[PDB]
């Protein structure tokens, strides 16, 4: 049923499926406290992400096994691109939550978090530079969901092509020429490689924070983490 929609219908369906912006459970931050806040926020967002995934056109058509694999593979990428998108109107800052807006200095509260902070900030400024639209964002996020675990398949690739058509359509409406359209499409998808990189870096750090027993992680967050070994 996903392949039948028009590109405008695809955009509307994705925009309507958007998860809510959650708040932090809000004092100057320590290592354990910030980690508590971030992992608690992530855990609550995961529940909304799962229901968001079901509302992505073509995702319910997949088996339960494949749905699990895609989410286990991409969940941190999805959290990150969401974070990066939220922080667009806040340069030099990361909007984890409306009541939790952090900058580079606060990233030093946690060791190794400083590097990830910069990469996230760099990604946000990149979206800001390109003037990323919300319609383009929801396309990119759904692409991550379907692509990241697809090589670990025909329908998914067909839905991926559909989203590609949707992206170009959005650019064609914006007034971009054919050359501009391909170029911007390429620019957007290349950022997905950096998002993948940040996720892998973030995943490794989460595994180490788990090992050090700094703060107890939720059973759900642990199971999403164990999937990446």
């Amino acid at each position: 049923l996903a392949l039948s929609l028009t590109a405008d219908q695809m955009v509307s369906a994705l925009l309507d499926a958007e998860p809510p912006i959650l708040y932090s459970e809000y004092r100057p931050f320590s290592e354990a406290s910030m980690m508590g806040l971030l992992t608690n926020l992530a855990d609550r967002e995961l529940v909304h992400m799962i229901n968001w995934a079901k509302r992505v056109p073509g995702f319910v058509d997949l088996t339960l096994h494949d749905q699990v694999h895609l989410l286990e593979c991409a969940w941190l990428e999805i959290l990150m691109i969401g974070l990066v998108w939220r922080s667009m109107e806040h340069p030099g800052k990361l909007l984890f939550a409306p009541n939790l807006l952090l900058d580079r200095n606060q990233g030093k509260c946690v060791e190794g978090m400083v590097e990830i902070f910069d990469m996230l900030l760099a990604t946000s400024s990149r979206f800001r530079m390109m003037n990323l639209q919300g319609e383009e964002f929801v396309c990119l996020k759904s692409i991550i969901l379907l692509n990241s675990g697809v090589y670990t398949k025909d329908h998914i690739h067909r839905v991926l092509d559909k989203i590609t058509d949707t992206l170009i359509h959005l650019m064609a409406k914006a007034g971009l020429t054919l050359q501009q359209q391909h170029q911007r499409l390429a620019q957007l998808l290349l950022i997905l490689s950096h998002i993948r990189h940040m996720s892998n870096k973030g995943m490794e750090h989460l595994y180490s924070m788990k090992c050090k027993n700094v703060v107890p992680l939720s059973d759900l967050l642990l199971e999403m983490l164990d999937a990446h070994r």
Binding site: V47, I50, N51, A53, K54, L64, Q67, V68, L71, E72, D219, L220, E223, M224
Partner: peptide, 9 residues
């Protein structure tokens, strides 16, 4: 898996 439960509901 918890992911199984949340995906079915």
């Amino acid at each position: 898996k918890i992911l199984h439960r949340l995906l079915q509901d």
